[PDB]
Subunit: 123 residues, 3 copies
């Protein structure tokens, strides 16, 4: 296997939060319902959502996309042991397929002020 | 040899510095003496410490963010020529063995306001 | 192919901005004209420029260059489709050859307050 693309995004949380206020609308366009909520039903706060949006931007960059994605065609989930994962369908899985990606590696991070993600696509 | 896990962490230096101030015992829970003490014996500055803790956090995420790992079981050192490295012992060395980790790649960085790191685990 | 080095850099945009305004000759030490200018001919804004500098700092780290690079021997450019790339010449190309680097992967990002980049070198 070989690296196909890498992506990084680092976002100020307060700014991301302000963007969600500006049309909401946005949240529904950015996130699947499953991304908004923990398995126990608790609602994610803004820093954690910012990290999930950063992962999607990082995936868009790893795929060489110029103007983002059909965001709902990408899904950040978390394995039982805690490792984040990306699931891609439709438009994003098509882009993935034409590049030859067989494997994503993703890491997410946040504190209250900064959220980040990195994605490595291999194939 | 293949990518097993990736980790990233990006932290506000001011926030890390606040946490260390809230709790004087925190520095010695996160760091070995070798990381805390500059040559000559002055305490390593907050920003440089923040980057090192970002590296241990990114290492944790590269290993799939598992239960039971002491921060002191990972050490950031700098080899001749300046590349950072990670020496792992005890709980962290056990987790890496178990995942079949053969080698690590790490980078870290800071300015006065923001510290960051990325870790790639290969096996 | 294996990973030879990794680099990350995350910068506060305002701090980078402040530095360039203290020493206005400095932009031309760090950046080629192609990096300073947008497709239309106007100077890139500070956040977008800080991402290109982050990418050079990340490249320097991936190459084990502790004192930084001869900056203008590295040029960040973007493929028609949207993927950023690093062209290296002179001292930087020479360093990559010394280390046996065969290919580079780069991603950069900014918002208004934070710029970042990650470089992976493989060979
Ligand atoms: Na030019």
């Amino acid at each position: 296997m070989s690296i196909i693309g890498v992506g990084i995004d680092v976002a100020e949380v307060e700014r991301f939060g302000a963007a969600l206020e500006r049309t909401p609308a946005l949240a529904g366009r950015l996130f699947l319902e499953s991304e908004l909520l923990l398995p126990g039903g608790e609602r994610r706060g803004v820093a954690s959502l910012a990290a999930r949006f950063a992962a999607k931007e990082a995936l868009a960059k790893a795929l060489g996309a110029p103007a983002g994605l059909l965001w709902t065609d990408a899904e950040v989930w978390v394995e039982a042991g805690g490792r984040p994962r990306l699931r891609v369908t439709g438009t994003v899985a098509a882009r993935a397929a034409e590049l030859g990606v067989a494997s994503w590696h993703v890491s997410l991070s946040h504190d209250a002020g900064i959220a980040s993600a990195v994605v490595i696509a291999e194939g």
